[model samples]
Target chain A: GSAVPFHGAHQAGIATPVQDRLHFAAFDVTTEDRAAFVALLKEWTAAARRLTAGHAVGEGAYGGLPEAPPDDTGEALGLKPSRLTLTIGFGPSLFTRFGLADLRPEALADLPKFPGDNLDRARSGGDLCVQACADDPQVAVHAIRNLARIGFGKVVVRWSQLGFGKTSSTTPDKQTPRNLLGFKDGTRNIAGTEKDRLDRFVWAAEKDGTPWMTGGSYLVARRIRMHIETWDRASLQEQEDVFGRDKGEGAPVGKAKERDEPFLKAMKPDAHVRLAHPDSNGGATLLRRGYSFTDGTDGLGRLDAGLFFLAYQRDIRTGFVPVQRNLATDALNEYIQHVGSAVFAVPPGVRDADDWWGSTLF
Target chain B: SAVPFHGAHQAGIATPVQDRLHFAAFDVTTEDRAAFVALLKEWTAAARRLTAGHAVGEGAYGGLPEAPPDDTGEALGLKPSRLTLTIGFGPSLFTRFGLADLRPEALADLPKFPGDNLDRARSGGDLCVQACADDPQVAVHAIRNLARIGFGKVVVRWSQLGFGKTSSTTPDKQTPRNLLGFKDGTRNIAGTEKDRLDRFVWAAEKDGTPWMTGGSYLVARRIRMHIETWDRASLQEQEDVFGRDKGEGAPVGKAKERDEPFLKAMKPDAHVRLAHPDSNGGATLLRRGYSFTDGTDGLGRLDAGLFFLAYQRDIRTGFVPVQRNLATDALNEYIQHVGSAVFAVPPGVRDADDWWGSTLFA
Candidate 1:
């Protein structure tokens, strides 16, 4: 079982065991024809099925139709599946075209700017998005590349991010991964095996009014830039006070074990962990699958690196919005900035080979 | 166990190419030789502890709270991941330290190649550190800590994060594919091939620089690929450019990837034909490069390519001659060299008392 199932009740990537690499892309639809756009979606679904199974798209990228472009890109030919998963989402902008305004899900609304926000428009928002994850970076990249090539005349990539290291994991049995700040980030995140938590916080249901989005989720993507150089210069006490966790063991304040429950008052009032805790925010939770990225440098001497934060939830109103607003006064804000943001409504998974992505809507 | 830090030569050069790379080029900020040399010793000590899956200094936390943490702590609880930190001295470094007398001739700045669009900010450096590991976070942590220890003595001039190795040192394993979808490094020098490693890769004491006997010369070229143009090409044209079948990666007119290619079977300007050792008077290089994607090029196209890294006994007879011969190559239309750097890697740390640059400094 090297491959994750591509057809299911819910998409694979959201609740799947976290992979080591990520290639996320936001696309702007160039065509106005509803039929053509739907066709492209069907084509993408077919290719995704083949790719997730570690098979080539179409005719295998070569040895057929020599005068035409190959159906598949060859870079991933000799590679394994690496547990690759491709998840699709529909952005708010998609509702503006194809006479689909009435179909827009309320949870897909644009995110508000929080304090210290420096969002770049070029890197935020899209009509459509695809999240590709795999243990192998090449496999993840190849899947996205082929999908983008197939959408050549229909869509154009607005922005893309390559993540080399996973920052969060659904498989809590494994060691917790660290963020750029060197602290365990998702210590209390929703786990894949916790069905009660997944249903309550991560998966949307038809009872919510949008039947097409049943079993789906909402995604919040924020490119958070870490001020690494400034952080390195901060004293040990100051760094620990900001995260409210020991850097070595990632144990919460006054606790000896990493998973020990936190005594909220024991931490500084404005500590990161205290502010983001569900107890302080009406028990709202998110399933996080973030990654670390280093994009060369900032022209100044510092590394342009940080966490590409991704969160999935049943709805943004009770999930990311309230939590993000609470983080306005977080002590860790001094060392990080939200530079890009996007929100999308993820549809339920394809149930069979004939059921393509967005089949419920189309 | 992780890679051994102390050896007859640096651990990275002939070692099996890792899955990820975090390479940094630094500018010596301080003019004092004593200050610079002191940082080198600190770096060597830290690198030793790191490659053994141990932490540096007092560790990331639990140190004097008033001082900065000794280690960054992000890599806490992580395996060594077979990490290796290879240090090199560039032409500028020798000039800065008044070590002109011991400057290795192979350390000369690389000559401009045809169609080079080198960016000044990404080109040269006083020194460089090549960190390779099975996990990107491990590689990144190694460099970040080294740069932290070098705060006052050096500043990072440029850095590159690469995922997915494009070349390999193990020829018997499956050949890896580059962004172009074709198999690469089919005939690369194997780590087990010590005779070829010594003949083509390792520098000899008799070659005029005694300090570099066990070392090698490194040539790094940031080659950017015009993948959009390439993606649209007919399958036949793609195969023609590389002089190999896209599916099997066999030389034109051959059936298997590893079968010896009859250079004459391919077109005059085929990439494999021009780059073959037979064409360049037997100039062979041990390549250990990686593929990289740095967001978009601001033109709606992905800024992705191969970060070409190779090592040899000397650049004059290695990269220089081969690159000159590639000016007429058909592959030139799809790629351009944008960043270039050359460094003379010093011999390895022989024991606990020995350190990086100990040979030249002695």
Candidate 2:
């Protein structure tokens, strides 16, 4: 009942209901040949279609050859589709190697340095990335693993994040989820059905530049670690004040309902919600699809937990950039640190035969 | 509907297998015995309210606009999805408090196994909580709220977020796989089997201290799988190592998964052969395991593995022998036991007035 159509003008994940878990991976291209790289993309798209349909990669994970290695990992064989979506994207580095610099989208540039960004070199920057999301973590993980398996020699995983408890919703019917903080995250998010809002904020329009990316979007991924111990030590009143939303109802300060328009003056000068609101920055907005993650423990006595933040926009220059720049002075910075970052230009979805990830650009 | 929380025995152990899990081990922070006990009482109340699909404290949604919210609002419109919160106490807790005399005989530290390259940072805790639900957010929200409430009284030592349960307790479930693509716990003990549960899982009055008559011992291990190496292996060798078909999960020379294992037909050092009860002097542990992937290891390898969660009437008789027998098995070459801990879980509540550790704290 929850299956999403894989063949579309754009990838389903951006506009689909934010799933419960995500297995996102960035890859560094090892193959120099354009033909080999494009070959892998074609192979991946076929598998993506089958996986989204709740079918196996080829002969399926189980009952394949008893001698040869498996095509699918077999972990997700008994599971349903879970509304799985695998969205592919290209980084700026990919344009440098494939003689495709001239075809690169202008909005696909690397992000500028931001405040409190202690970016780890190992976790940041990749030639390509794939976002796999589903209600079942194993389904998402299985999909990513199989794709990585197929690209064993040509592409290697840069870094991956297994995230649970989605931080945003793209459908109006779904409830807003929380990050490590107790407040509702991305309550004012753009819904999938809002055609005008989506065209303005998400889909790249034709006149803006690269014709190959006319229907595509830009994806920004940031891994932000939550300093829960310090945040937990703060008073509840202080927590609410920092976020500019009631911890329970998720209403703006002085507002009663979650959907009520914010009274910007009622918020603190440095409140996070006040600074990041679209009204504060030329009506610039992007679709947020973040997820919560805990990767065992740090060497110290604490849980290594954070929000794996994702944003999709028609152009970052007008969307995430100015909004994040506005958040430089936001009070919530005291409780979070950006540890990893990456940007990708997601091409239009595969509509039919001969349609691939970057076919038009290539 | 959500599972009942105020039962004679704790919920998670015998409850239905949930697809999502958030298991946390905590280090007790306070020295005052009364304060520590009070936190447990508070946790118990919250668990009851949450498991019933209601917001904590009088089911208030819009109430208390001025004060901090009782419920964390992330799961405001979500269903309960059978969330179960199970609590446990490690041996360190008995020594820290003046409750040494009440320590059960069956509750003790696990002996070092042959293949365990255990990490100090990932091992041991004074307390543990297993929060599980069908929805990942529901499970995550339950743990976050409990940890939030236990703030000043307990610090997170190590936590594991797991998805796609690897085993089942309810009779209706089909077998699921671990990261290595093997069907795990196909021969597991079902929770509905009264005789098997009493013999192998539930602690009896004669086993130890009266406080744990109905409780079970919990053993946790973080087993990291060298999947790259395993993925390169031939299917024939993989099946030989596991002593079962990778596709059917059937024993060697058998046609079905549940068919009684043919010990002689399997290799002398096969994994299933060595760990089976017949080979290990009738040792059997009820497994409730899950798969985990923690991005990359910064060495181009996936930090993916299985979070092994097992429960038994006694570790010595149930888990120790079986695990010790598996140390030199063929599959040991592909796995490293990196984290481990043992805990003494006390008996469950008998009624509404009874709390989590009522048998001991009362």
Candidate 3:
């Protein structure tokens, strides 16, 4: 299940103060009719408002107004505005579920060219919402199921991405791994400003081959499991050499300046001689947006902690791909592994009058 | 550092949605405290608006307002709101770097009675506002310096909770987990309007004692490790008796509803008793909330996960206590121990109002 991205940045002003606890859910709708989906949106909105009571916020299509209606009555106490985003896709799984096996190939062959070609294939493998709650899992579940009734093919429930304070200098500390490791992660990245937006994300409008997708973006999610205890057991020098930064201060070896310290300066003198050397790759960079989780304990004494890595870019090849390749042989790779991966082409943004995925080739 | 429960919730709402995407950091300031937070809120709102740009909806928070601000010729664009909650604890932390190190006798022998105890703690703790942007880490780092300049002690810094969604459900099937290991979790748990307010939440004003007068609830986050090796073995052994694979998370003695023999039929006097009375106590628990996380995969070869559980009860003993006892049954023996912590969450207070703990303790 998915939720509509929050409206304008000013949206939070008039909204109610947030509840100390936050919960949210995501779902994918399966019915093929855009009209049905739209109708369901209305129903879900009403139901969600009722279910969440004062916790409910306004709902709308992409790029629409996000502010709640003004508090007409003086007694209209404000509540925090929880957000939900929904994404739709068309794939072959749709036909299989519809009992149209005989018509599958014809449908697939006759598919229209949208932003991405594998609509039918993607349809068979429909979208799933990433359910998240700030400290409250119940509220998140309610939000997810509420979306499900609206209709979605498959739903995969997950936790939210990791975020930390400013003092955290390293990527690990900034974001959580599936397990708890003190080191900060997600250091090298692009800024999320208009000047840098294009640098980080691929917009449909910018590409000549995909005019229908003028406002859409692409999403890449990777599940990277981390070995925190193993990493922690290593000597301080070894840790610094692996991450190319001092473990305690996250600084370069010989420099005291925090951000000014070059990546190469943090490398160990003897250990720096190799293809996976930290300095030579020009500091592989990618916007890392994800969290660390504890997937319960097992008898084997294994702790599951990793990063839910998500990066958005106009071109995956130039963005996440190259960085991932660089990381393949990087010293950090020894402590982590990529277990689950997925690539989805997010459609262009749309307005109220348009179908959710109307702009793309769903 | 510990965030005022109410403040975090309010910050969750007031801060621009984009701020939710990044780490959360607090800045301490004694000068124009309210204004400082307001500026933070505004900056975050503007930054999100800029990042989202045209992709944002008119109804969204940052969407340009139809009317211009008093000083502006153009429409009032949205921006994030940042505010630090000012909680008052009676005495400052002088010896432990803003830490609490009260002796038990000192706490009990204070001149004030229990009724005044809450207030005594309030004077020591105060909150200040810092900017929250889409890239909060940078903002946090910058804020840390500002706090230091203000002679504010940096008490805590860790990743903020709940931002993006991650995976946690049973991998193979789309079915969500319930409190009890039933195929379909709570189907009839209260989701109705009448039960929404009463059953789901407890208002602080209504039930809290004077000491916790303004506090609404408490959240206990315990990372319960599982015994995967033993669970796997149990699954194989119980598969025949229960007629379902434990690893696959199937119901006991069942395939298709009518096909598999019932638990009683499986054995005349077997311990494979169901929890639900109708199915011999086959189905139980209204598993309202849970999320999975991979824990430490240390030398034990153990695969750890989180048992995200929640209970809504006017009294903790009535709900969580009973459930814990039930969970201690044979079904859950394999899962062993790990980390646990409890957080006392205050209720959501009004704008400009200190949290319940702030006043009650002060």
Candidate 4:
């Protein structure tokens, strides 16, 4: 059977070697009752644990009864686990509505509107989010589908994004996958191999603050739609200038090797790398987990291609805001538009046998 | 990589199924005849090189430092993974750019069946490119580059990203599972069967469309899976719905998967009983479908479904009758026929001078 252990410290997907596929969803808490929400969370935990191991949602996906609905959706019956990981996160609005304001972490706040940001309201926010990653896309989709089913009347899926093509290399030793712009992405993020960097940049430490929020991280998702027509017409030099890296080597300007230090002076003032580099922002770092998505086309007959930019940071203020602010005037701005943005305060993973997703909040 | 790109017939229709797909349908927006064909030629060059595992340009890493690399770096260092890029021309394309009257007879618009809730935004287009590879990013990257280069020349009317194919063209390969959690393509036509391929798959020169000699017609249907309802069915009921055993994937009355299906023993409303070739006057189709999940249904349901793709010499006799037979099948209750389209996919290029649609352009 295909499955991964449901047990993990923080969450397996935070830097889970960048799965080949992703199915991320934002949900709204529908039921007014606290018990219903708690029940669903318990139900989701059991199902997620079973699903991660490549089994059905219940005792068996099929053995429930001849007349009864099967516990698991059979589509993944023959599938291998594909290293499934279901990471859960709660938005800022979640605490306010659920009487969980006291449990909310300080780092969990609504993202500040950025310059040139034109986000669609339908895609922007949600009370909770679930990120499912797997090497097999169907496996990922199946997990999400079953979880959504478990939440039926308790919560509703507000918006979702299906992304393939991991846009970041979680492993530092390997060259990361490239985004639509044709350059290696997430290369500058703290690699998963560095325990020190992982602790400082990704894992939410004892907030000495929100004790329950420890071992959790913040997730920021952005839908960056690439300007297809304009980029297509741009010359080779123009593209390299926009990215400030050699397209093939992924080496920074004036550098031959990918890992070599970028000669910032050689890079354009508006080069994307220069503006977003950690060194440029006083060593501010993020544990990035981004994916590329192509959702049909914009009604105007253009490919709605872009990056579903995802980053797990210990704190947003010191992580994404300043980096994005530094990127406002970057050269890559002309070719991409942020269509969807959301920030969720992810609670820590279940560590005890009795725990579930919102155990601390409950 | 399973089949050579240069051939008498396209690779996607009968080639071994890949794990991922990125299908883009184009709307020709240019009136400049030479430039339009020129773009096709350029795409062919890229396609040929990519399939062979070469960089779109000579210098993959050491390319001009200030120039954009020929290949999008996302798939850099990745194996070919048997990538296939298949092209097709829709009926609408015949009406544009002096291509009038070149539309093939076997490639006419599909007739709506009993219950089709198609979305116009995703249903039809003027041209299409189907890219499939084991690596999703590779497939998506290929389509993006193709679409990127076609910017001013053509607008992408619609694009679909699919993963985990529902059918298998190689008999040796394990049968794939559909979204319904059932093994499919048990009785599918194989590329290895040359006689069956010539008789049932590829179009003949005498089909009244002179431009389509040695070509085939492609039919795409977006079949949305009703997981909410299907999840309620027990394993036995689920198997009965498809007239196949869930565990072994055998027919209702059979012992092994390869055992011939006994239609008489199947349920009156069984899906396989009605759609099997023997039941549909010898109708046969070479299925090249892949699974897809866009987002949510604007409700609680995940907007996930199968992007059903099929190729046949004659749609009226093969795909049409088979689809009509399934209109009343019991399995129809958990599935909806949404997006649909038909295109005349011309024969493959023989050499360098040969272009994608050279017959009509010539």
Docking class of 1: medium
Worst lDDT 10-window in candidate 3 chain A = A70-79
lDDT of each: 0.88, 0.83, 0.33, 0.81
Please, what is the TM-score per model?
0.97, 0.94, 0.40, 0.94
Clash count for each candidate, listed in order shown? 3, 0, 144, 9
Q: Candidate 4: lDDT of A362?
A: 82
Q: Which runs in model 2 stand beyond 4 Å of their true positions?
A: A233-237, A298-300, B55-72, B165-172
- lDDT for model 4, on a 0 to 1 scale? 0.81
Q: Model 3, A40-102: lDDT tens per residue?
A: 555543444433332332332111222322111101112122332233223234334434344
Superposed by TM-score, candidate 4 places the C-alpha of residue A341 at a distance from the truth, in angstroms, of 1.9
Question: What TM-score should be assigned to candidate 4?
Answer: 0.94
lDDT by residue (tens digit), candidate 4, B206-244: 778776778888999989988777876777789889898
Docking quality (DockQ) of candidate 1 = 0.63
User: Candidate 1 or 4, higher DockQ?
Assistant: 1
- List model 2 lDDT by residue over B1-362, tens digit each: 68888766898898778777888899988889899878888888888888877777644335544555566556677789889988999888887678888877787678888878998767898999998887767887777678778878898888887766522221235777788888888888878887988999989988757788889999999999998888788778789998998888999898999999989999999998898999998998899988888777776688889999999999889888898888779998899999998888777866777788878887
Stretches of candidate 3 off by over 4 Å are: A1-79, A82-140, A152-179, A197-202, A261-285, A352-359, B1-362
**Residue A125 of candidate 2: its Cα lDDT?**
87
Model 1 chain A scores worst on lDDT over the 10 consecutive residues at A105-114
What DockQ do you compute for every candidate structure? 0.63, 0.47, 0.03, 0.54
User: How far is B172's C-alpha from truth in model 3 (Å)?
Assistant: 40
CAPRI quality level assigned to candidate 3 from its DockQ score: incorrect
